[model samples]
Target: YFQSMSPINLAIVGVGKIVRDQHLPSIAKNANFKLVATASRHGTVEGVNSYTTIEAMLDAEPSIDAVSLCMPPQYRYEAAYKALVAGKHVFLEKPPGATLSEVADLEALANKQGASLFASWHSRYAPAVEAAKAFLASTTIKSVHVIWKEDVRHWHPNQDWIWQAGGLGVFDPGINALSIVTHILPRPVFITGAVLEFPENRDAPIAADIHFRDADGLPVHAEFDWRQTGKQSWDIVAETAAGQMVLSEGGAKLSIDGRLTEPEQEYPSLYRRFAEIIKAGKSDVDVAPLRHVADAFMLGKRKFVEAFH
Candidate 1:
């Protein structure tokens, strides 16, 4: 039999915009977690013990039962390794780590250490995502089209890491769409072909067009661009036996045959799931979404475009 535990002592690493904007608010509201400390080179949480490195934070806060690593993917693995080795549960932000092998290794480590590891995909927790999943599963989906575009300057101003070699570039936001699509679809999908557009001055692609198909030949197409100017688009439209289903606004709102249902918060639900997993003495790690991106990078043809600046 399992016993109940209340208020897991939690610490956050690499505090930044997402931490302040989403994680903090969600952690504050969730009754199963208590914010105890933070580790960041430049960002710090008020009224919490802060350190410049994860090692320092771990050394000082022996009571920390869990740590949420919110750093860029490139640096996530080391911190996760350290936390897991220390026997603390871990929560990883979207896109998990820089590579599939690294995330897989972390999962192995977490399992060996008997610590709960949560690879969180916040978009999948959006208000209408589950509803959309149910709708798709109930009917026959003929085709799937994902349109995820946004203005990078507005959403990720001055973030240099995103344009670097290991950075995902357009795939950063695009992965959120993939997370939702991968969840709602009935079967696994594989990339048939892809084209990635890279800026002349950057290592990563600024846009990507990908074609995917499942075992039954279900077609799934996706377009991701970081150059959207006027109105941002994060929509998925599926043609099904019943009618056209449009999951719009990053899975916040869903519409079927021109009728719509509204939205809700994502991070709060994410924290709830993390708490549940921790209590259950289990780990939740899904890499199918990340696997799609890796396949795109490996097989996709690359085209160089004008400099982003």
Candidate 2:
């Protein structure tokens, strides 16, 4: 059972798809939180104090115990910076910030301001993810293949922000795979080689080929593409001395040598963790996966293609 509290007041910023689909539901269901206010240029939270700008929300809502920043990674830092300065705990959506540099700066600010910051990765909260982690930990990993292909048109449609520079494009989804992998692996992994493929008209890649490894010399290959049509595949298969293991449905479902498992509700679990962190007065900022992303950009070769639009 969750701890006793009437409700931990929360204000939301950047109400969008992710906020509507994930953040709102998570906050509403969490016994620890009371969703109080929202800030968005084009959106508003129902039955709560709302503002067009986060500046206004921060200025007026001193009752908010924490703020969840759900804006695109590109604009996340400034609002998060303001929220922390006003003495509120912060929750960041996946991929944290557009660039590693900005997130680093935010970390320092959080320390000075004495507020917790949560860089949430909902996929890591997937049910079978821990089971898979246990399985991989129990076996001797031989070689690994992660195929994370999805129908971009069906999933992303015409979201132009995805194609822009610093939008992360394929890495946006691909980071989920990396998050689970990083969590399951016993040893810390690092990028060895990578290639990001961008369409001629866009600044981000529609696909990426990344190579990663650890001190044990285990080889892992990842392919993230936005061109799959039917049968969206989100499978991570690993070969071990024990048998072949597969984590499917983006970590919701799991299998060993081919067997089905139940799906997991990730957002609720994420909110539960957030409450724990707040109660503990601690911050959870694991940048391993994101650090690898920055490293990939810094070292990977870049290529261009025909425009998607």
> lDDT scores for all predictions?
0.93, 0.86
lDDT of 2 at 11: 89
Candidate 1 residue pairs that clash = none
After TM-score superposition, the amount by which residue 89's alpha carbon in candidate 1 deviates from its true location, in angstroms, is 0.6
Residue 129 local lDDT, model 1: 95
Candidate 2 weakest lDDT stretch, 10 residues: 255-264
lDDT string, candidate 2, 167-217, tens digits: 888888889988888897778878899998888878888888888888988
Q: RMSD in Å for candidate 1, one decimal?
A: 1.9
As a TM-score, model 2 comes out at: 0.94
For this target, which candidate reaches the highest lDDT against the unseen true structure?
1
Q: Which residue segments of model 1 deviate by more than 4 Å? A: 1-4
